[PDB]
From Swiss-Prot, chains A, B, C, D, E, F:
Residues 3-101 form the BMC circularly permuted domain. This is Bacterial microcompartment shell protein EutS. GO terms for molecular function: identical protein binding; structural molecule activity. Belongs to the EutS/PduU family.
Amino acid sequence: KERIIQEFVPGKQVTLAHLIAHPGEELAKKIGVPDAVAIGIMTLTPGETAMIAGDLALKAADVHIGFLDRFSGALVIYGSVGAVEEALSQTVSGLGRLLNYTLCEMTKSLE
Amino acid sequence: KERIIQEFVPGKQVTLAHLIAHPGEELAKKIGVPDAVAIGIMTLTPGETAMIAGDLALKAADVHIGFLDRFSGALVIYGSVGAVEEALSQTVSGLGRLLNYTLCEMTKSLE
Amino acid sequence: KERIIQEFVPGKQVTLAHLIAHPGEELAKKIGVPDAVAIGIMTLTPGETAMIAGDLALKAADVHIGFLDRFSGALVIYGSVGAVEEALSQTVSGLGRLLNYTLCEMTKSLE
Amino acid sequence: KERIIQEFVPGKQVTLAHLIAHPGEELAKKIGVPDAVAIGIMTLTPGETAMIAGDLALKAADVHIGFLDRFSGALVIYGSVGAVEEALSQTVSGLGRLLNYTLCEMTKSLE
Amino acid sequence: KERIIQEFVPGKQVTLAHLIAHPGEELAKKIGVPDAVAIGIMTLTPGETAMIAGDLALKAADVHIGFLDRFSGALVIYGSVGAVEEALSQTVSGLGRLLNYTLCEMTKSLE
Amino acid sequence: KERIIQEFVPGKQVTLAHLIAHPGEELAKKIGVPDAVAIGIMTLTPGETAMIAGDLALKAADVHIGFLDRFSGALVIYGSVGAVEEALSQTVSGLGRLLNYTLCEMTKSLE
């Protein structure tokens, strides 16, 4: 085979930014967020980006932090479908702009 | 040898989607799911995909979340063999469709 | 040096499948399994494979789950040397068959 | 495919150094820092660099450690916008100077 | 830059096998082993190899398990300098033999 | 893109060895070491190297273990600036000598 030594470092990337309107009570309960709200999901690298994204999203629309995970880089917000959608949209563009992140497409699940 | 610096980032992939009808009480107990039900197993990357897959599966058939792990990316559902099988099938195609994931084949264990 | 971006994803592999007859009480105590039994050890990737392997092994011979680790991908079974050996043999082939895993040789420690 | 063996080792890098004036009480509460203060965010590799950066930042301006994470390599400081900004600026240059780290640009979020 | 997708899997390797005679009470306390004994240190990949090595070492000489870590792949034994040395020597060769591991040199610290 | 399978294994490396005289009470408190002492910081791979380095440093000068982390590979010592400096110096050379590690430069923060 081949042996390579590899100095690892975090990349800067928004891997997914997903909207889920009408998650349902079971999923909501599992996730640890309020029922009857839309939901925004982001994975971020490095993990500390979640605090930055948290700031952005809060300032972008009327959304709330379900939870913020500075280790995994997870961030979950909730609120109206419209608020969550804007918050997501704004936060992705803000990261590529302020920090020149690798970005992704915003995605959605409905029904 | 050779030294490479490596900025790591999560891939987007469904690595496995497996059905297990008749798991048995011992395995069920270990896994932390009800007995007398079929079982669906998925590994997902990044870990946060488990919440998205959770949504999809719940909406695809009459299945329930045994547990959802947004860290490892694990998701276990249960229900009838038919319900679990459809939920699995739907969830994989839904991820490749909505999010353009790398997908896998659905698999099964019976007896 | 060189900078590479690396999207990571789990491989599908059975890295080891080892039989240990006569482990002794000290090792058994450390491992958290009954004394006076043979022992089967498997490392699996991804971690969720341990539930699938758990199913296979239980169905292959008269063995029992010492523990199943869906995070590390560890699975430890115990029983007679013959039962453990068959369970191991069957589970490896089953994974390569059902899921086309990268497989390994079965190994053993005696005395 | 291809098989490579990879001996992993930590790189030496400041991946981000971000200033957030006016984070808001919600974000502040989530993050575990005082309200009404600016905030500095750094990700560092290896994780132990957070203690070194902690030293630098404290000595650079009138800032305080919200928290220091020698595992993830996270470090959060707070104080006036001016103090936090200087602390950040100084700490980045200090690491590249003393330890020849790979550095980044300082960034900021306002409003 | 360059983007590579990387399916990760554990290698099979004994990275170090080190003997420490006369560790001293402070170090011993930190490590969580008895004082007045020599000490053997191994790092193993995958993590589950520690249980196999544990078996080998116990059978090779009159040594005892300080602790066995099936997650990190750590294994610490203790006993006489001679017993620990033989246990180490035997365990390394046993792994390369039974499992065709990548091996290392045995090392020692004295005084 | 490109798919590579990657068997991972720990490298053997001292990534940093840093001296901090006059850390201050705040930083000291955060770090979990006594005030009014100099401080030595090392990151080591693999994680188990921290026990070996712990032995070396203790034997090299009149220093004490603030803490030893066999998981992350962290080791923090304290004592006089001179004792800590020698302990660090000795431990790095000892590792390259006994174990042929990849080494680093010793570094320091003063004032």
